[PDB]
């Protein structure tokens, strides 16, 4: 089992780095792909790339070795980098949802409103919020719990467990995950509503001659909308649910499961290249980049 568990972690790093490098390459190398949406995809790909290169590898060792081997400063910095990139990843998914929603439902209002320079500011905000949720509280010890058992892991340089006070785990989880989740639900539900209402008008227009049914395009749109919310929620909801549970009755969920749920969230960073870069232009770019 533990032989297979380490081999699994290896490809998680490979899939993330391979995938996200390939996206960033495709966008930077192809003039056609340098659209406004793909500016946000670039932000996402960078965050997931740093997760693959630095965050997940150091995490892999901690599971295999059973202990932190790089000392207390690098435990903090690795944890800060982890939180930052997960926050920037999830908050960027939320921005993409909004971007696509406006691009689909109000395409003309969107073109004048969403400039490239306004997009650059949105991207910078996401990374600034990510930094202030992660580096500022973790390096300055605001995240620290008072409990004696927690204080034993903070002093031990071999221990790098992710233990926090109440306020931080609530505020950090809401800003990094739950607000982004709700916005994404709200936004994508309005895409479904706008589509459903549009079919109702087409049925009304016919003067009782036809009733529209879900064609090939509508089933694909609904399946695509399912993958987006489904994979995002499956990968991160369990971890972030348990992260709040730990703040109250900490003995309820075992440590091995909470760790396993964290690996599921890291796997999201491998999924995003596959979910968000399926366009014809991306497929042409990927073939060209692989000779």
């Amino acid at each position: 089992a533990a032989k297979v568990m380490s081999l699994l972690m290896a490809l998680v790093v490979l899939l993330i780095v391979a995938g996200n490098v390939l996206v960033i390459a495709a966008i930077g190398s192809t003039q056609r792909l340098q659209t406004l949406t793909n500016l946000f995809i670039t932000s996402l790909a960078c965050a997931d790339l740093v997760v693959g290169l630095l965050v997940v590898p150091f995490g892999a060792t901690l599971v295999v070795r059973g202990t932190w081997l790089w000392g207390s400063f690098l435990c903090e910095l690795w944890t800060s980098l982890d939180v930052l990139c997960v926050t920037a990843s999830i908050e960027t998914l939320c921005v993409i949802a909004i971007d696509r929603y406006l691009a689909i439902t109000s395409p003309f209002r969107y073109q004048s409103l969403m400039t490239r320079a306004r997009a650059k500011v949105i991207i910078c905000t996401v990374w600034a919020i990510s930094a202030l949720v992660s580096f500022l509280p973790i390096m300055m010890h605001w995240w620290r719990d008072e409990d004696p058992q927690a204080l034993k892991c903070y002093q031990d340089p071999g221990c790098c467990d992710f233990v926090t006070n109440r306020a931080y785990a609530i505020a950090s989880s809401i800003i990094s995950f739950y607000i982004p989740l709700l916005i994404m639900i709200f936004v994508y539900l309005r895409v479904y509503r706008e589509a459903k209402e549009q079919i109702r008008k087409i049925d009304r227009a016919s003067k009782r001659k036809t009733s529209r049914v879900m064609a090939m395009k509508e089933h694909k749109a609904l399946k695509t909308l399912g993958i987006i919310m489904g994979v995002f929620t499956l990968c991160w909801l369990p971890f972030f649910l348990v992260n709040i549970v730990n703040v109250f009755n900490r003995d309820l969920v075992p440590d091995w499961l909470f760790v396993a749920f964290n690996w599921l969230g890291y796997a999201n960073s491998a999924m995003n290249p596959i979910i968000y870069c399926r366009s014809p232009d991306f497929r042409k770019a990927f073939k060209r980049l692989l000779a």
Partner: nanobody, 120 residues
């Protein structure tokens, strides 16, 4: 397969009017933009007019107040009522459908084109 069928073009006198019409057959996602582009000889393809499924519109400045884009409430058909034509409006006019069915990216369909020649 999706196909765009263009009609209503041809020769016409300056100050006259045409009514282009593009009937899109096949599965199109309910959220989309049907539009008209044009390519005058030895120039680049420009937008003329576009109408979103919702109802909002977008016109180029050269044709504002003269042209009018509308669409069939029932089927996927888009009309361009061109009034007060000038010799500058002479071009191959292309129908275009931007389909939003993939959510993350838009898929494009182009018609073959239809000639519109405006003489003085």
């Amino acid at each position: 397969q999706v196909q765009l069928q263009e009609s209503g073009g041809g020769l016409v006198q300056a100050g006259g009017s045409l009514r282009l019409s593009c009937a899109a057959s096949g599965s199109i996602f309910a959220l989309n933009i049907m539009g008209w582009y044009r390519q005058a000889p030895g120039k680049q393809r420009e937008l003329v007019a576009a109408i979103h499924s919702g109802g909002t519109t977008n016109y180029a400045n050269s044709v504002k107040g003269r042209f009018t884009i509308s669409r069939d409430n029932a089927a996927n058909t888009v009309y361009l009522q061109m009034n007060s034509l000038k010799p500058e409006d002479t071009a191959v006019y292309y129908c275009n459908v931007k389909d939003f069915g993939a959510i993350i990216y838009d898929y494009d369909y182009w018609g073959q084109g239809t000639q519109v020649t405006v003489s003085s």
